[model samples]
Target: DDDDKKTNWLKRIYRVRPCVKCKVAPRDWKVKNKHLRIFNMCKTCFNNSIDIGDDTYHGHVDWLMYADS
Candidate 1:
């Protein structure tokens, strides 16, 4: 059951990606440059235009728990 809970959390995080351009749903965006040169555009935006850089803050996650929800 513990492992199942962890898996659920992972699924939830994965589903959080939303599209930046369409603003419909969150989508995964990659860091275009080592210095994050491209704006944080979702997959759609990246494919459409010349991305410069996203003015969004970047950070890291330290840990996750079974009951984190």
Candidate 2:
């Protein structure tokens, strides 16, 4: 029962935040009969994105070196 409950809860979360491409809310979507929240953006939308690229400047590379007496 607990597992089922967990699944249900997840479903709700997904419903609230469905895929970014999703047009309608999970509640309005007719995917399932039971009330469910839909997400505007899915995991892909949340995760995947244009990569700006790795750090160009190395740490302490350009900075003037200092010596301690």
Candidate 3:
């Protein structure tokens, strides 16, 4: 709780940009895989549509990217 006081203050400065689909600010945005398309879609919108097998249609393949070799 104490540490988050400063962290919260810091977060206010680096505000999130609005998502293209929802037109509301989100903590993170989505980008297309392989082709590197910037949808500017928020996590909530991404997960909602992608969760119901919509990701495969767009070649998303995975929910998120981490590290690859």
Root-mean-square deviation of every model: 7.8, 20.0, 10.5
Output the better candidate (1/2) by TM-score. 1
The list of candidate 3 runs beyond 4 A from truth reads: 1-17, 27-39, 52-69
Against the true structure, candidate 2 reaches a TM-score of: 0.31
How far residue 37's Cα lies from its native spot in candidate 1, in Å, is: 19
lDDT (Cα, tens digit) per residue for candidate 1, span 1-69: 786676576567545644546666455533333321223345556555445564342332322444433
In TM-score terms, candidate 1 sits at 0.36
Question: Quick one: how many clashes does candidate 1 have?
Answer: 14
lDDT of 1 at 5: 74
Best by the lDDT measure: 1
Task: Give residue 7's error in model 2 in angstroms.
Answer: 0.1
List TM-scores for all candidates, in order.
Answer: 0.36, 0.31, 0.32
Q: Note the residue pairs that clash in candidate 3.
A: none
Estimate every model's Cα lDDT from 0 to 1.
0.46, 0.36, 0.45
Model 1 stretches with alpha carbons more than 4 Å out: 29-41, 46-53, 57-69
Model 3 C-alpha lDDT versus the unseen true structure: 0.45
